[PDB]
Each structure stands twice: as C-alpha cells, then as structure tokens.
Amino acid sequence: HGFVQNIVIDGKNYGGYLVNQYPYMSNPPEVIAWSTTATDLGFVDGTGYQTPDIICHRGAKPGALTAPVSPGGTVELQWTPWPDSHHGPVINYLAPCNGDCSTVDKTQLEFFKIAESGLINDDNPPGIWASDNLIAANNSWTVTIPTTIAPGNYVLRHEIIALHSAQNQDGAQNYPQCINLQVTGGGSDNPAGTLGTALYHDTDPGILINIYQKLSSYIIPGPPLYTG
Ligand SMILES: [Cu+2]
Ligand SMILES: [Cu+2]
Ligand SMILES: [Cu+2]
C-alpha cells in the first residue's frame, strides 16, 4: 500500500495527487497527477485488469496540469514508504495524448513500455526486486524520457506490481500512478501502443507466480519494451 506524493522534474517539485487528503475535499487543487478513488492506498488486482481501473488506478481522471520535461530528461517519482514485503517489478509506460492530456479519454490511451525492472537477485528467495531498489532509493524511482520518441503531451503510467500474494489467481497487486508530461525534443518514433486493458492478464507468468521458491528467471509483465 502506497502512492506517489511528489514528482521532481528539472529543479522543482510538482505535488502529486494526495489520495489521503484530496478526496476528502469538495474543492481539491489542480495537479499534474491524475485523481483516483484509491483512498485505501490499495491496488487493482487481476479481477480489474479488463476494467478501466487498471489504466490509471480506480476511478481515475486526468490531472488538470502538464509538466514539461527537458529532452532525455529525468522524472523522479517519490512514493510513500514502500513495504519491503511488497516485492515486485516497477514498470513505466507512455501514451500520447494527441492534444491536452487534461481532456483525454483514458480508455483510448495506447501505452508503450519505456522502462521495466523486475527480479534483480534471487540469492535469498523471495529475492531482491525493483521494488527493493525503489526502497533503497528512499522510496523514489527515476524514469528517463527517451530522446527518440515524438515530442508532445503524454501520460506517464508508473507502476509497482506487488507479488507477495501472487501465488493465487488475482493475487498480484497493481499500483499504477499517472501523471501528465510535455515531452520535448527532436525524436520521431511513434511506438506501437497497447490499450490499458490489454496490458495484463491474470494468468501471465510474471503475474500468477510463487516468488517464495527459487526463480530461474522472471518475465516482467506487459507488452514488449520500446528500445529506441
Ligand atoms: Cu499493500
Ligand atoms: Cu524481501
Ligand atoms: Cu526510430
């Protein structure tokens, strides 16, 4: 359980969608982060992979604002403290808004994977995962925006998938967090995108999995990584 509190880009903080504060107001502030109804700080499990909830989390609506990023710039997402028990991959996608991200229909977004990190070491099962890297970085993840993609407005869908209960069907816990970015530069690629509801299926080998045994490999879920 947790969420993204803050986003650091080019020397300033962009406050996140504070899901334990803003839902409790009739008049919440405008931010670059999508609003959600996930006030339990919880997740979307396999029962929701083909519902709109998987796209940007439960009940999500686009943020009003969009943050510019320098070409090949970094975006640092700062989480609430991630539990070590919640071992799993950290995955990053972009989907073009083809216009203002604040007015997109999320069900039409087509995401391409820009980064993925999974099982890092398995000397002591359940092992060390991307989630553990996130914890070791004081609950932060740094995403680099590719220089090779077409500039424009994009949703960044940043996600941890916790696997501590994933040995049962629908036991994996997805924690997607979306923010609006203005990607800048000279790139030209428009990578093939995957609908949010076609990212994951509840029997995928990286989703329905027993992490407590020795693992010879880990197939990070979702569509293929865009490599340039
Ligand atoms: Cu949890
Ligand atoms: Cu562990
Ligand atoms: Cu190219």
Report how this structure was experimentally obtained.
Answer: X-ray
Listed resolution, Å: 1.2
| Cα–Cα nearest to 110, from 207, 16, 199 | 199
Question: What is the Å distance from ligand 2's center to 6 Cα?
Answer: 25
Ligand nearest to the CA of 150: 3
The dihedrals phi and psi of 45, each to the nearest 5 degrees, come to -95, -175
| Cα–Cα nearest to 73, from 119, 159, 11 | 11
CB atoms under 10 Å from CB of 62, counted, come to: 24
Task: Find out whether 207 and 172 touch, Cβ atoms under 8 Å.
Answer: yes
| 188-to-72, 124, 138, 151 alpha-carbon distances in Å | 13, 43, 35, 8
Task: Find out whether 139 and 80 touch, Cβ atoms under 8 Å.
Answer: yes
Instruction: Give the CATH architecture of domain 2-228.
Output: Distorted Sandwich (2.70)
Residue 120, CB-side half-sphere exposure with 13 Å CA sphere: 14
Question: What is the Å distance from ligand 3's center to 148 Cα?
Answer: 6
Question: What is the Å distance from ligand 2's center to 220 Cα?
Answer: 18
Question: What is the Å distance from ligand 1's center to 44 Cα?
Answer: 11
Ligand nearest to the CA of 162: 1
What the block records as the tokens of 15 is: 């406050």
Domain boundaries, the chain: 2-228
Ligand nearest to the CA of 149: 3
